[PDB]
Amino acid sequence: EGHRVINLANWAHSIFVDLNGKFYVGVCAFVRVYHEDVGYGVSESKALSLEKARKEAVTDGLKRAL
Template identity: 45%
Template sequence: MHGTYHPQDAFSCNPNDSTFFNLSADTEMKLAALQAKLNQKLGPEYISTRPGGNGMKLTYTEGWKVINLANEVFGFNGWSTAVVNVTCDFADCDPNTQRYTVGIAAIVRVTLRDGVYHEDIGYGTIENCKGKGAAFDKCRKEAVTDGLKRALRNFGNLLGNCLYDKEYTREIQKIKPPPPVS
């Protein structure tokens, strides 16, 4: 019937079908190896904790650790970051103490060599800071690092997405990390 869509008439749109992306066997193998690496979860040596609300422990990975992991996974020249936007949500100065409370949001993009990218938002805050410049400096850095970590986690468990799995974080906290290699 004219003007009616029939699935059998369409070309294959199955992303698991290599002809969809027109990939060589070598490229398919490289992507599969990369995906297998990204599917792994972080070991206890990459995970830190800090107090959260209601007596809970929050798990996170430090910025330098996730940057090192991204360098290991993608290569030092296989990925890049860009700060897409920075917004100051508030900057208040207490007239009595002349101390600053600031909140800044940043959108960060992580782009791989092949052009694939993920963006996410990060946030930085400080309360009761002596100097205005120091308050803005700390908040911008914190917001960008947070946005970077959040953007990287979109690539897979190995880059931090596993930290959103509450069962995993509960179990991994029970494991003592190995001593650092010197």
């Protein structure tokens, strides 16, 4: 979760498909703050896929910053 980073840091973070009945989408997720480190995310309804994409990439992105 973002709680660990928000506690330690204090950081800001910026930001395809498959499509029948199963979904998977790209990420376009970046992170800033010090310099930036970018990552990418995966998914698993389009809303659920996009949201999950954004979760994981941030998680991976924060790790690299660390």
